[PDB]
Symmetry: C5
């Protein structure tokens, strides 16, 4: 079994797609192993670049294919090189930009946290072993973080493991285990932007909707609610169109639904106070009571939301 | 007739396009057959990867081209390999990402269910038979389902068949039947998100629209109706822009049309009650009757919608 | 002149682009001609697939290039094969997906009808003739039609013709006529969806806008119009954003403009009735007259729209 | 200096990108020059197509690369051919689809006019001269123009010139002038659609906004303005989202700004008339005066806009 | 160490992507060095174009690969050429369009300024030195600037430097320093468009919101605020949808949030003035005081924003 040492340099993780749970990773991949020694020009290591690489493979050079397991579509490989050492060492180095898949739960949207993973595995060989994996995710940790959209927490975690494929041929007596390198980078979303421009105004609207009870007439109370109703519909549209697209109910989507309910409940109470008492009494002890209670009931339900 | 065994590993089915009735399928395809025995290095099976494969084809190796019948544009094939066995067996294995087509009826949008199908067929040979198809759609069934957008019902069903092409040449006396593998995966859309964030507020708005009859004056009743009218127009826009795009009337689209009608009918009744009675009587037995009847008429019509 | 028989199988016509007047066509293309006889393996027809085809062309095999005249960008060709017959026949078969152009007038948008055309022509040869064209547009005609977006009317029409290119070289004495195959498929748009979810609510709003005349006060009449004004602005936005994009005025766009005018004319009449009569008379014989007349004037102008 | 005669057939100019000032050009390019005579099959001109062309170049055939100077990314070339004449003539013909750049001023958006240009230049040779350029922009001039989005004014203008590159090597004593072909096609946008569906309603809204002065009460006058304000905000959104995107203020954008100002100026006058006169007088000679003057002040300022 | 002279011609910098902090660069790259002398046809420098270049590399020609460090995906290279001089000089020249990455802070959006940078580095050699970098950013400086979206300030800055890579192999005793060319072009965004069509109406709306205090009744004051509330929600949507997309709070977003706060504070003051005084007094000295003070308080807070 050939010992393969890999190194993955991650330049940038960007372009997260919430609809398809994917993310882009730009960087380099280096893999080193030792083969039979070789006569090189003079005796310095020989450099073979791009189109010249397949010329060496056609003459018999063994270059194993390593596949990104969780990639989404063939990645864009930039420059690639082979470094052929006279003592037998071989170093493959290539620039790449690829889109990778991982299970991503966005339910607690503004305050959610995700981990971006890479999964590397040889495409055809089980008799060849990944010896050690070093990733160099040397993007900043203390340069721009409050300004940046995602907060990387710690240095990336690595784990070389062995994957057992059962459904295989019938001629392999026991060779159905492959070496898989797994890189993981944990990150937390910076909610600053979504707090100020989305959650804050949504609170301001939800709060100010309760000021309908400070209207004197019943006609004033009920008719204004329909203008508040339209405002929440507008704000829900503004929220869903500008924020990333999701077929899942987010924290903000609960806040939106809560606002929807708060207005509908107000309409019920406003009509209730009118027609609850005999002979047209307006239950003024209700309008004034919920004038402060209605704000409190929402805050109590919000805490049980975090139950 | 050559016996070819295929195996299709489905990693992920995603990216449904409602406008073009397409869907993306990432996974692997394996095909195995037995040919004339062959001298391999030593005597272990030889592995030929990617660019090296066409070198073997130029020297005479027979590798049939299998076409995805229902594919939408040439798919993106990642790494590919040939496993050449000394006794004659040949195993082709390739990673692919492709877009596939099938008839998809989205009319009952939030609660609809679809089946994703693959159709495999040799491109040039009828004297070569697909012997058995095993698909490994080992995506979860009981890990994430309530969180996931689609619910896979069962393991994929397959069907190898023979397709008769009539319009052909004139030199084939009887050989116009091709082996077609057909894989089918049934799935049900998870309506959780669309119920809470779309159907529920639409109900709350439609319901609260009936509270126009609880206004005392006629001027209050008619003018408020026009503000409710704007809200339904606003909500239909929010609905059509955020939800997947469709040139077909969906369940939600019927609910939207229903809200449109409920408001217009209210305006008729509101105006009717004013000018229906002689000498300016306001038919107060109507406003109060439909105050509860108008909500009920909508519920009765909704049940005949499910007829 | 070489006799070339073509056959075009049309799997699917989809993805009409109203902004660029284009549409996608998936299917196969077959071309057959007879050349000098040939020694084949044994004596069965030889099959040459994909990358192996250019190998035969480099050894001298004459394979003419057929260009889609009205294609938009080089089309995506899937699998391709050559079938070489010993008696001299040669059959080229290839799967393709391409985007094609044709003049498409969408002015009567919901009820418009278009025809999708293909135009085939050899790229370099005029001394080579397309002998007969058979298209197999065996998409359904009586399976799904009311559910489908477009209605195909009849079997596709074909026409081989001769195109005269004048601006050419100076060395051709008379050879400037090329063989062109022209396929035409006529189709009518299914207006069901646009009627119910777009045309119907637009009528309901336009109609209900006239109910402003049933308000008793003049202040009620004028102020309500401005809320109705906003509703038409809102509905025009919803219409233009969801419906296909066009730099041309459609039937719906005329209906929208009509709604704009109906409201502006209402504001004129409402203000006119106030200040038309001496000493502050409110011309109540106008408000009630146009209470019914204003709806009729719209219907009369709508019929002259179809003039 | 080799004499190269080019001819550019322009099939369609479409896909104007206002954000990036680009446009797509589909058509053919032909280039002819005379070289050393050649032994051809028999003695008829030889046709070399697509993949076969580079075979002749590897054997020594001189085929110069002509670059589209103003192209945006490598263009999509369809079929290409070489016609090798026995007397030495060589004719290169190729189908192409490319995106081209030019400075485009969209400030007078609905009524603007642009010119689409192509710039052709050899990539490596200054000792080779473009002898004459004939373009065949035989798209219609009198077939569909009122229906079409753009109006082509005349046949395209050509200009072969010499471009002086100063910053070059140090070994060229005087050879730093290159032959550049420049094609120009002038076009005027058909404003019919934008007039009816955008400019017309914006006028109606701006006009109808002035009808606020016909309200009797002061409370009626001020409150309605905010509904008209919302209408202009709504209409500004509808305008910017559907119309092509631009980081420049257009004619329509000025009309929008004008509507914003008309309403804001109205609010000032409405509040001014209330509190301008001593003892609470409502300056009724103002409300009625600007009832007609405010429309005129807008019309007077609009004519100074065309100053 | 080989001396390599590069020259970078920048035709156009366009397509800034605010979400991914990228920008497109179209232009040419020229690189010159001197090698062992060479026998050329006759003795003039030989020109080798495109596909013919790799033929010389297969025969042994050394052409080093230079990589754009900050590129986002492999760039699109148009025509490329080699100029082989008899005395040993070699000139590589290629057209390219590429997407490049750099840290871009858009927080002060309308008035922000950015710098577009390129970073060039050899892919495999440290024993080869970039001798001098000359960029020709000969885009206009005094032709169109007020009309153009970006303002280039000065001639582009260059800096050849040495980058120390630590994490490397174990066989290099001291050779881990690479030559990096860094080009920088400073640019300031032209805020003209965003001022007139976005900042100005936002001011007009924010200002006119203060006119709620000039209403006489309390019911008029509170109900109108909710219509003003909806207008800001609409305008926030229009702002975020049309302006470039950003997960960061911009100057406009602060102006938007300020408008949100201004209205909510008014609702508090409007309700405060009602219920602050004993026995139902309406604190008319507040409504009139903040009638002018509320405008001033916003202006006072706005200057401390620029603190």
């Amino acid at each position: 079994p050939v010992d393969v040492s890999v190194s993955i340099f991650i330049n940038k993780i960007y372009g997260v797609n919430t609809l398809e749970q994917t993310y882009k990773v730009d960087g380099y991949i280096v893999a080193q192993w030792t083969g039979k020694p070789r006569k090189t020009p003079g005796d310095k290591p020989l450099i073979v670049e791009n189109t010249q690489i397949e010329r060496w493979i056609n003459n018999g050079l063994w270059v194993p294919a390593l596949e990104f397991i969780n990639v989404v579509g063939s990645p864009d490989t930039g420059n690639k090189r082979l470094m052929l050492f006279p003592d037998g060492r071989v170093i493959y180095n290539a620039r790449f930009l690829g889109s990778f898949s991982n299970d991503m739960d966005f339910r607690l949207f503004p305050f959610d946290r995700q981990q971006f993973v890479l999964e590397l595995e040889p495409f055809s060989y089980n008799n060849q072993q990944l010896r050690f994996s070093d990733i160099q995710v040397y993007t900043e940790n203390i340069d721009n973080e409050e300004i940046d959209e995602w907060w990387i927490r710690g240095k990336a975690s690595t784990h070389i493991s062995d994957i057992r494929y059962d459904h295989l041929s019938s001629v392999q007596p026991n060779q159905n285990e492959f070496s898989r390198i797994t890189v993981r980078i944990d990150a937390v979303r910076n909610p600053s932007y979504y707090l100020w421009s989305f959650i804050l105004p949504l609170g301001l609207i939800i709060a100010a909707s309760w000021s309908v009870f400070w209207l004197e007439s019943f006609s004033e109370r009920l008719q204004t609610s329909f203008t508040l109703m339209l405002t929440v519909v507008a704000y829900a549209f503004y929220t869903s169109n500008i924020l990333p697209r999701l077929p899942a109910t987010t924290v903000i989507d609960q806040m939106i639904i809560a606002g929807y309910g708060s207005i509908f409940a107000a309409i019920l109470l406003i009509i209730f106070a009118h027609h609850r008492q005999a002979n047209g009494v307006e239950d003024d002890l209700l309008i004034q009571r919920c004038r402060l209670a209605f704000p409190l009931g929402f805050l109590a339900i919000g805490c049980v939301l975090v139950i």
